[PDB]
Structures are given as structure tokens and as C-alpha cells.
Scaffold this motif. Structure first.
Motif, PDB file in Angstrom:
ATOM      1  N   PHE A  81       0.766  -1.348   0.070  1.00 55.33           N
ATOM      2  CA  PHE A  81       0.188   0.125   0.328  1.00 55.33           C
ATOM      3  C   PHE A  81       0.815   1.231  -0.080  1.00 55.33           C
ATOM      4  O   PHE A  81       0.284   2.131  -0.772  1.00 55.33           O
ATOM      5  CB  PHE A  81      -0.778   0.010   1.429  1.00 55.33           C
ATOM      6  CG  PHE A  81      -1.525  -1.540   1.628  1.00 55.33           C
ATOM      7  CD1 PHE A  81      -2.777  -1.525   0.495  1.00 55.33           C
ATOM      8  CD2 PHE A  81      -2.168  -2.095   2.430  1.00 55.33           C
ATOM      9  CE1 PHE A  81      -3.506  -2.654   0.433  1.00 55.33           C
ATOM     10  CE2 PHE A  81      -3.406  -3.400   2.502  1.00 55.33           C
ATOM     11  CZ  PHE A  81      -3.420  -3.491   2.018  1.00 55.33           C
ATOM     12  N   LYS A  82       1.987   1.029   1.030  1.00 52.35           N
ATOM     13  CA  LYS A  82       2.786   2.361   1.060  1.00 52.35           C
ATOM     14  C   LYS A  82       2.895   2.565  -0.773  1.00 52.35           C
ATOM     15  O   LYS A  82       3.627   3.400  -0.648  1.00 52.35           O
ATOM     16  CB  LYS A  82       3.817   1.944   2.212  1.00 52.35           C
ATOM     17  CG  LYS A  82       3.607   2.429   3.709  1.00 52.35           C
ATOM     18  CD  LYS A  82       3.269   3.820   3.452  1.00 52.35           C
ATOM     19  CE  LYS A  82       3.608   4.536   4.308  1.00 52.35           C
ATOM     20  NZ  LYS A  82       4.959   5.583   4.693  1.00 52.35           N
ATOM     21  N   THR A  83       3.477   2.014  -1.479  1.00 48.06           N
ATOM     22  CA  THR A  83       3.933   1.736  -3.068  1.00 48.06           C
ATOM     23  C   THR A  83       3.054   2.022  -3.658  1.00 48.06           C
ATOM     24  O   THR A  83       2.975   2.941  -4.549  1.00 48.06           O
ATOM     25  CB  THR A  83       4.346   0.881  -3.281  1.00 48.06           C
ATOM     26  OG1 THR A  83       6.455   0.601  -3.510  1.00 48.06           O
ATOM     27  CG2 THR A  83       4.766   0.707  -4.464  1.00 48.06           C
ATOM     28  N   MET A  84       2.167   1.855  -3.711  1.00 48.44           N
ATOM     29  CA  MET A  84       0.839   1.800  -4.610  1.00 48.44           C
ATOM     30  C   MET A  84       0.229   3.057  -4.296  1.00 48.44           C
ATOM     31  O   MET A  84      -0.598   3.703  -5.375  1.00 48.44           O
ATOM     32  CB  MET A  84      -0.899   0.521  -3.490  1.00 48.44           C
ATOM     33  CG  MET A  84       0.163  -0.664  -3.750  1.00 48.44           C
ATOM     34  SD  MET A  84      -1.326  -1.141  -5.461  1.00 48.44           S
ATOM     35  CE  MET A  84      -2.551  -1.529  -4.761  1.00 48.44           C
ATOM     36  N   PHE A  85      -0.021   3.098  -3.002  1.00 49.12           N
ATOM     37  CA  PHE A  85      -0.076   4.619  -1.861  1.00 49.12           C
ATOM     38  C   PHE A  85       0.470   5.514  -1.538  1.00 49.12           C
ATOM     39  O   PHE A  85       0.764   5.211  -0.109  1.00 49.12           O
ATOM     40  CB  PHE A  85      -1.471   4.576  -1.877  1.00 49.12           C
ATOM     41  CG  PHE A  85      -3.207   3.905  -2.907  1.00 49.12           C
ATOM     42  CD1 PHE A  85      -2.624   2.696  -2.703  1.00 49.12           C
ATOM     43  CD2 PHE A  85      -3.818   4.620  -3.409  1.00 49.12           C
ATOM     44  CE1 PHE A  85      -3.582   1.952  -3.686  1.00 49.12           C
ATOM     45  CE2 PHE A  85      -4.412   3.106  -4.242  1.00 49.12           C
ATOM     46  CZ  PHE A  85      -4.844   2.461  -3.890  1.00 49.12           C
ATOM     47  N   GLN A 131     -10.487   0.124  -2.408  1.00 50.92           N
ATOM     48  CA  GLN A 131     -10.616   0.936  -1.095  1.00 50.92           C
ATOM     49  C   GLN A 131      -9.658   2.448  -1.176  1.00 50.92           C
ATOM     50  O   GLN A 131     -10.086   3.357  -2.263  1.00 50.92           O
ATOM     51  CB  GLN A 131     -10.925   0.529  -0.205  1.00 50.92           C
ATOM     52  CG  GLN A 131     -12.106   0.358   1.549  1.00 50.92           C
ATOM     53  CD  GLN A 131     -12.572   1.501   2.324  1.00 50.92           C
ATOM     54  OE1 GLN A 131     -11.827   2.322   2.375  1.00 50.92           O
ATOM     55  NE2 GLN A 131     -13.992   1.269   1.601  1.00 50.92           N
ATOM     56  N   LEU A 132      -8.539   2.197  -1.633  1.00 53.86           N
ATOM     57  CA  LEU A 132      -7.554   3.256  -1.374  1.00 53.86           C
ATOM     58  C   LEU A 132      -8.102   3.350  -2.727  1.00 53.86           C
ATOM     59  O   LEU A 132      -7.659   4.827  -3.529  1.00 53.86           O
ATOM     60  CB  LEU A 132      -6.284   2.678  -0.963  1.00 53.86           C
ATOM     61  CG  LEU A 132      -6.041   2.376   0.508  1.00 53.86           C
ATOM     62  CD1 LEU A 132      -4.841   2.126   0.592  1.00 53.86           C
ATOM     63  CD2 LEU A 132      -6.463   3.867   1.147  1.00 53.86           C
ATOM     64  N   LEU A 167      -8.675   8.277  -6.403  1.00 50.34           N
ATOM     65  CA  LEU A 167      -9.213   8.565  -8.397  1.00 50.34           C
ATOM     66  C   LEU A 167      -9.992   9.610  -8.087  1.00 50.34           C
ATOM     67  O   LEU A 167      -9.918  10.148  -8.216  1.00 50.34           O
ATOM     68  CB  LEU A 167      -9.988   6.916  -8.010  1.00 50.34           C
ATOM     69  CG  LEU A 167      -9.580   6.061  -9.075  1.00 50.34           C
ATOM     70  CD1 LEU A 167      -9.573   4.320  -8.901  1.00 50.34           C
ATOM     71  CD2 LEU A 167      -9.926   6.510 -10.896  1.00 50.34           C
ATOM     72  N   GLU A 168     -11.148   9.229  -6.547  1.00 49.07           N
ATOM     73  CA  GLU A 168     -12.137  10.578  -6.420  1.00 49.07           C
ATOM     74  C   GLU A 168     -12.886  11.136  -7.793  1.00 49.07           C
ATOM     75  O   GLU A 168     -12.127  10.856  -8.607  1.00 49.07           O
ATOM     76  CB  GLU A 168     -10.971  12.165  -5.487  1.00 49.07           C
ATOM     77  CG  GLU A 168     -10.778  11.769  -4.505  1.00 49.07           C
ATOM     78  CD  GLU A 168     -10.533  13.162  -4.483  1.00 49.07           C
ATOM     79  OE1 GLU A 168      -9.939  14.168  -5.088  1.00 49.07           O
ATOM     80  OE2 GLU A 168     -11.681  14.093  -3.451  1.00 49.07           O
ATOM     81  N   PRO A 196     -12.450  12.105 -14.281  1.00 48.59           N
ATOM     82  CA  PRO A 196     -12.553  11.466 -15.140  1.00 48.59           C
ATOM     83  C   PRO A 196     -12.358   9.580 -14.817  1.00 48.59           C
ATOM     84  O   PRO A 196     -11.327   9.477 -14.093  1.00 48.59           O
ATOM     85  CB  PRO A 196     -11.695  11.579 -15.916  1.00 48.59           C
ATOM     86  CG  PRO A 196     -10.509  12.241 -14.696  1.00 48.59           C
ATOM     87  CD  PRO A 196     -10.950  12.340 -13.598  1.00 48.59           C
ATOM     88  N   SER A 197     -12.415   8.982 -15.689  1.00 49.73           N
ATOM     89  CA  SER A 197     -12.770   7.596 -16.031  1.00 49.73           C
ATOM     90  C   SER A 197     -11.123   6.994 -16.308  1.00 49.73           C
ATOM     91  O   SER A 197     -10.139   6.413 -15.803  1.00 49.73           O
ATOM     92  CB  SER A 197     -13.886   6.474 -16.600  1.00 49.73           C
ATOM     93  OG  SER A 197     -14.063   5.514 -16.419  1.00 49.73           O
ATOM     94  N   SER A 198     -10.823   7.668 -17.775  1.00 52.26           N
ATOM     95  CA  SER A 198      -9.896   6.839 -18.060  1.00 52.26           C
ATOM     96  C   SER A 198      -9.350   5.492 -18.475  1.00 52.26           C
ATOM     97  O   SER A 198     -10.184   4.970 -17.742  1.00 52.26           O
ATOM     98  CB  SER A 198      -9.167   7.677 -17.553  1.00 52.26           C
ATOM     99  OG  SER A 198      -7.874   8.628 -18.492  1.00 52.26           O
ATOM    100  N   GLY A 199      -9.601   5.040 -19.474  1.00 50.78           N
ATOM    101  CA  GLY A 199      -9.243   3.733 -19.475  1.00 50.78           C
ATOM    102  C   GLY A 199      -8.975   3.557 -21.422  1.00 50.78           C
ATOM    103  O   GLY A 199      -9.761   3.881 -21.962  1.00 50.78           O
TER     104      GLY A 199
END
Length: 67
Positions: free
Chosen positions: A25-29, A54-55, A60-61, A64-67
Motif C-alpha cells: 500500500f505504501k508503494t501503491m499509494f 478502497q484506496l 481516484l476521487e 475522469p474514468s480514463s481507460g
């Protein structure tokens, strides 16, 4: 002897991974806070698959979606 009784095997280890998770998680977020990350971990009750989404969204918040 063992006769009649025929049940399924049920081990008890539930090793689970928390320390590693935190790191992940530390690396992820990075923006995430050790308190938050864990918060989710517990809030979700030890569940990376979840703690992630979750994170994930959190980061994201509403945007935009993007993909």
C-alpha cells in the motif's frame, strides 16, 4: 483405527499478511497515510483485495474514468 467418522480437514494457521500489505500500500499509494492504509485494513478487516479498491477509489476521487 479411525472408523465411521469421516470429516473434512480443517487446518488452523490463517497466516495472513499485514506487514507486507502495508508496504504494498505504501508503494501503491504514497499520498496515503499509514494511519489511513491500516485504517482501511482494519475497517475492512484484513482484506487487501478490499483495502485496495478502497484506496484505489480514494486516490481516484470523483473525476475522469480514463481507460
Amino acid at each position: 483405527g479411525s472408523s465411521g467418522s469421516s470429516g473434512r480437514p480443517a487446518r488452523q494457521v490463517r497466516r495472513l499478511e499485514f506487514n507486507q500489505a502495508m508496504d504494498d500500500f505504501k508503494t501503491m499509494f504514497p499520498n496515503m497515510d499509514y494511519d489511513i492504509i491500516e485504517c482501511v485494513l482494519r475497517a475492512n478487516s484484513g482484506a487487501v483485495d478490499a483495502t485496495i479498491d478502497q484506496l484505489l477509489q480514494m486516490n481516484l476521487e470523483s473525476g475522469p474514468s480514463s481507460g
